[PDB]
Amino acid sequence: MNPPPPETSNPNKPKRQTNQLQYLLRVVLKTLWKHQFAWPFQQPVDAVKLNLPDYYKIIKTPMDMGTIKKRLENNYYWNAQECIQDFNTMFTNCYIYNKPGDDIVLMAEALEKLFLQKINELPT
Numbered sequence: 001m002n003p004p005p006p007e008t009s010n011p012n013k014p015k016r017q018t019n020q021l022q023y024l025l026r027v028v029l030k031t032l033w034k035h036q037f038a039w040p041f042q043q044p045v046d047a048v049k050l051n052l053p054d055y056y057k058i059i060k061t062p063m064d065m066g067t068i069k070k071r072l073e074n075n076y077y078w079n080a081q082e083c084i085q086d087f088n089t090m091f092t093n094c095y096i097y098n099k100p101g102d103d104i105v106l107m108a109e110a111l112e113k114l115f116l117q118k119i120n121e122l123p124t
């Protein structure tokens with residue numbers, strides 16, 4: 001019922017280590033991680049544990065902060081924009097699967113606004 005998690009390594013993918021990417025890990029991610037609403041987004045959605053066989057029938061591009069953290073630690077990304085895309089996929093997935101006002105959407109909304117606050121300004 002659970003698909004394979006997103007990849008966190010890809011040896012033929014060209015990696016790069018930029019100051020903006022070190023800041024996504026050290027500042028942006030690792031503080032979202034400590035938020036009280038972070039825990040549902042710290043690993044892939046477990047459709048078996050949740051008894052939600054419907055999740056991966058709706059969400060075809062899954063993403064979680066657990067995956068993003070490992071991609072940052074492993075220098076998976078070419079630039080910060082690629083990592084910011086993964087965050088936005090994580091948020092959008094939650095808004096697509098759930099409905100306005102759901103508890104999980106409130107958590108996503110709060111994390112997103114803190115996220116956007118923190119990447120308004122990145123190192124140069």
Ligand SMILES: C[C@@H]1C(=O)N(C)c2ccc(-c3ccc[nH]3)cc2N1C1CC1
Nearest residue numbers: 040041045050052055093094097098104
């Ligand atoms: C599937 C949907 C969703 O979009 N996310 C991101 C998510 C992540 C984690 C958990 C979760 C609850 C208890 C253990 N894990 C639940 C969700 N939900 C929503 C329906 C409660």
